[PDB]
Design a protein around this nucleic acid. Structure first.
Ligand code: CL
Ligand code: MG
Ligand code: MG
Ligand code: MG
Ligand code: NA
Length: 328
DNA sequence: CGGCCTACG
DNA sequence: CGTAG
DNA sequence: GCCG
């Protein structure tokens, strides 16, 4: 009664097993910091199964038969049910390795590999990093200078204001181009740590060269605190107005041709785990190769045309899930 | 045991 | 290496 | 870590 892939079941944003899923997610995150992507995936998948259940797990019996629950994830849940805490989870939470890797990887421009190297060198705090700016990229310098603002949640109210300013620049860059809110806010989140936008134009080909024109215009309006500069994804830090001041916010801008827009919308709406699971399902169960540009049949050597996300779910033999049910 | 999503900057 | 969902 |  519980399918094995997250793309085969609705997952709402709020659910009935929040504490259990959060614990499993700590173990997933810690596995990622050690480079164990397989263990990360299993703990993420097990967490997501609990998000999709219709009521709280109250007894270990209720895990029997659920996919992605083996000895380890079951023991975590058992300890939480019996004692309200899991010793392994709490040991990870208080560990210097976990806390420092979490802090470093949260920096824009720093991934697991950089964070791990800094950890092995003995670095532990952001001020440690600030004291040797020679070992930092321009991107990392920006991420470090803006880290405090970037750690503050972006509210839905902030999103609406940002969308209007992006639409103004996009309209001058290319009249008729459109801006669609994606990522977590499209799935119904009330907060986030960034804002994701997808830009297209109804006339195929007109979107070529668009993103540099949009970036130049936002830069000229004084709104860009940082960006990496032909391109189609821009990872920016924007100046967002606040009462009597402003704050830095991460904004991602993506361009797609309208022929690819359903695939880009699907990919950029997420969740991350939902999309990994959907691509895994496509390839392993249907023999089709999915990305944010299209869906390829490698036997016929043809690309599926899609005019909607609904088309893509139908192509893959899956019941449609609206964005609010993709919170795997 | 092999596999674990698949891109772009 | 970083980034994204 | 789990699935097939
Ligand atoms: Cl692993
Ligand atoms: Mg986002
Ligand atoms: Mg983003
Ligand atoms: Mg992210
Ligand atoms: Na980072």
């Amino acid at each position: 009664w519980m399918p094995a892939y997250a793309c085969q079941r609705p997952t709402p944003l709020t659910h009935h097993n929040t504490g259990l899923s959060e614990a499993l997610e700590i173990l997933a995150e810690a596995a990622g910091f050690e480079g164990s992507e397989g263990r990360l995936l299993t703990f993420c998948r097990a967490a997501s199964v609990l998000k999709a259940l219709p009521s709280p797990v109250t007894t270990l019996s209720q895990l029997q038969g659920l996919p992605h629950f083996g000895e380890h994830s079951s023991r975590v849940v058992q300890e939480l049910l019996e004692h309200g805490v899991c010793e392994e989870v709490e040991r990870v939470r208080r560990s210097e390795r976990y806390q420092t890797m979490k802090l470093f990887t949260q920096i824009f421009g720093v991934g697991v590999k950089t964070a791990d190297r800094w950890y092995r060198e003995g670095l532990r705090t952001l001020d440690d990093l600030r004291e040797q700016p020679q070992k930092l990229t321009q991107q990392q310098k920006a991420g470090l200078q803006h880290h405090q603002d970037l750690s503050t949640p972006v509210l839905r109210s902030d999103v609406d204001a940002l969308q209007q300013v992006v639409e103004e620049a996009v309209g001058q860059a290319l009249p008729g181009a459109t801006v669609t809110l994606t990522g977590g806010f499209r799935r119904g989140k009330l907060q986030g740590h960034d804002v994701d936008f997808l830009i297209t134009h109804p006339k195929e080909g007109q979107e070529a060269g668009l993103l540099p024109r949009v970036m130049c215009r936002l830069q000229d309006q004084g709104l860009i605190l940082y960006h990496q500069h032909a391109f189609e994804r821009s990872f920016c830090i924007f100046r967002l107005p606040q009462p009597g001041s402003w704050k830095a916010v991460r904004v991602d801008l993506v361009v797609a041709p309208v022929s690819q827009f359903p695939f880009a919308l699907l990919g950029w709406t997420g969740s991350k785990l939902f999309q990994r699971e959907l691509r895994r399902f496509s390839r392993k169960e249907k023999g089709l190769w999915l990305n944010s540009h299209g869906l390829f049949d490698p036997e016929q050597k043809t690309f599926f045309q899609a005019a909607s996300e609904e088309d893509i779910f139908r192509h893959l033999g899956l019941e449609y899930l609206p964005p609010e049910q993709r919170n795997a």
